[PDB]
Amino acid sequence: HWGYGKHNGPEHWHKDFPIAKGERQSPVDIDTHTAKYDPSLKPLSVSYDQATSLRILNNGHAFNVEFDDSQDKAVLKGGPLDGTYRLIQFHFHWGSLDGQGSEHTVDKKKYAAELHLVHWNTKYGDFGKAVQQPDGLAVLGIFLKVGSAKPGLQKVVDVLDSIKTKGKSADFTNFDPRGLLPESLDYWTYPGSLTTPPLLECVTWIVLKEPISVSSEQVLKFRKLNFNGEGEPEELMVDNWRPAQPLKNRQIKASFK
Ligand SMILES: [Zn+2]
Prior knowledge:
GO terms for molecular function: arylesterase activity; carbonate dehydratase activity; cyanamide hydratase activity; zinc ion binding. Interacts with SLC4A4. Interaction with SLC4A7 regulates SLC4A7 transporter activity. Interacts with SLC26A6 isoform 4 (via C-terminus cytoplasmic domain). The protein is mostly beta strands. The protein has one domain: Alpha carbonic anhydrase (Carbonic Anhydrase II). The protein contains three helices and 15 strands. The termini are far apart. The structure holds zinc ion. Residues 91, 93, 116, 195 line the site of zinc ion (ZN).
């Protein structure tokens, strides 16, 4: 099955998931000079005050911090979005080295990592239905650079030892995702896809311009995770990012001048 290795990595995915070569695949390079300011973009609304985290899971390709999405608690709206999108999970993609790891790039620049806060459109009732719709998901993407520590990330970092291998989970309640956001909510937005198989073309991407800073020690602990299950040969969970895909017939819009 698919992964990020030499023989099952992104260049292989199209054989099982032909949509890999589709018309609105993600991630993409964000050419900042070609992106156009769109004054019709409403302000972005991130309402995470009632967020209820439940669990953190190593799923063999990343780790997911999962939320209770059975009520409108933590929601994303405004910006390019019509209606209300409910937070279901967040996860990261990261590199083996600080110079790579992000999925989106900015004028071909790669960041050390990228945070994805995944939301689904409540008009479709559940997440499984939402991924079958062109406007089913909204993913808020946030770049990570290495510098000062992000205090709000440390609780995530310290539980990773308990979910080292594929299929392990741990209770992870009362985590506040507001601690992972940068100061500015300036963003780029474009229509795209899941960046992992099945690569469904159901995502409105909202990528923040301002990165957050995390420490070398924090990202080093990401890199101690395992792709493998317990009692299997160790393969470090690093470079779990898909590279930039062709933009094709799409325009990236900016929320800012
Ligand atoms: Zn992702």
